[PDB]
Amino acid sequence: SATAASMNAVKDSLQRGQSTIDVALAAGDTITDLLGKMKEKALAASDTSLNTASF
Amino acid sequence: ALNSINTNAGAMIALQNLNGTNSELTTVQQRINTGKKIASAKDNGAIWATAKNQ
Amino acid sequence: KLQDSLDAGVGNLVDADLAKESAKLQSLQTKQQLGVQALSIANQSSSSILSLF
């Protein structure tokens, strides 16, 4: 029965690991959106017919 | 805990998705009211400035 | 999004599962009624000595 108590100790650590990964995933989604937008900006600026004040 | 009486993640996630849809509706309604994609300087700064100067 | 996640995490840490307490509560009420009847049965020991004299 001591071992069953220890399993009770293990489950919380597994749950904490889940939580940390969720936070990381949220930040990652935001970062991927920002990277898409940055690609759009760089692509738009790669144009050689552009004015000096839009670059 | 799947039986917790103090919290539930399903409600929070449903709230987040509902708010996302509401923001998208705000954007589309703006597009309809003004009649154009880039109305203010928040939509796209570069193109907005270009159109003003042009 | 972050505040929602933190609230859900804290709840994950310190929330109970009431379904288990219901079963345990029923078992404990039965067990306490039984322990009372058992104690009452054990109490009446030594009551037979009077018949000897």
Side-chain angles (χ1 to χ4, degrees):
Chain A
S1 66
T3 305
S6 315
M7 311 275 197
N8 189 359
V10 172
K11 295 156 84 176
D12 64 358
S13 176
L14 284 180
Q15 283 173 330
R16 172 193 313 141
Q18 277 185 354
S19 54
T20 69
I21 296 195
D22 309 68
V23 188
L25 284 167
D29 186 74
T30 290
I31 285 176
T32 51
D33 212 331
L34 286 166
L35 277 162
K37 205 169 320 193
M38 293 177 70
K39 172 183 177 169
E40 191 163 12
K41 284 290 158 294
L43 190 142
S46 175
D47 186 355
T48 68
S49 66
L50 204 58
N51 211 348
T52 312
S54 305
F55 201 105
Chain B
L2 283 74
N3 285 100
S4 87
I5 193 66
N6 304 277
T7 191
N8 55 332
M12 311 171 148
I13 304 170
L15 271 163
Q16 295 167 7
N17 295 108
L18 172 55
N19 292 332
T21 59
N22 295 351
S23 72
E24 205 157 359
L25 263 180
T26 299
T27 292
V28 65
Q29 271 174 14
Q30 265 187 358
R31 192 94 52 95
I32 301 299
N33 298 320
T34 294
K36 34 172 71 173
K37 328 185 188 81
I38 297 89
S40 43
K42 293 186 286 185
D43 297 17
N44 214 17
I47 302 179
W48 179 82
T50 311
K52 269 293 182 304
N53 290 253
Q54 206 63 74
Chain C
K1 274 299 144 180
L2 183 62
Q3 185 197 4
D4 291 331
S5 182
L6 265 294
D7 279 333
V10 166
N12 222 336
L13 268 70
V14 65
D15 284 28
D17 177 75
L18 285 85
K20 292 191 151 23
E21 289 84 5
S22 43
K24 182 174 73 175
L25 173 60
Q26 289 289 345
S27 298
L28 288 162
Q29 306 200 25
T30 59
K31 190 175 188 313
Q32 169 194 18
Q33 193 57 40
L34 181 56
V36 176
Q37 270 308 100
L39 162 57
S40 57
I41 285 165
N43 279 119
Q44 294 168 353
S45 179
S46 71
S47 61
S48 65
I49 303 149
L50 294 174
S51 51
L52 183 62
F53 302 90

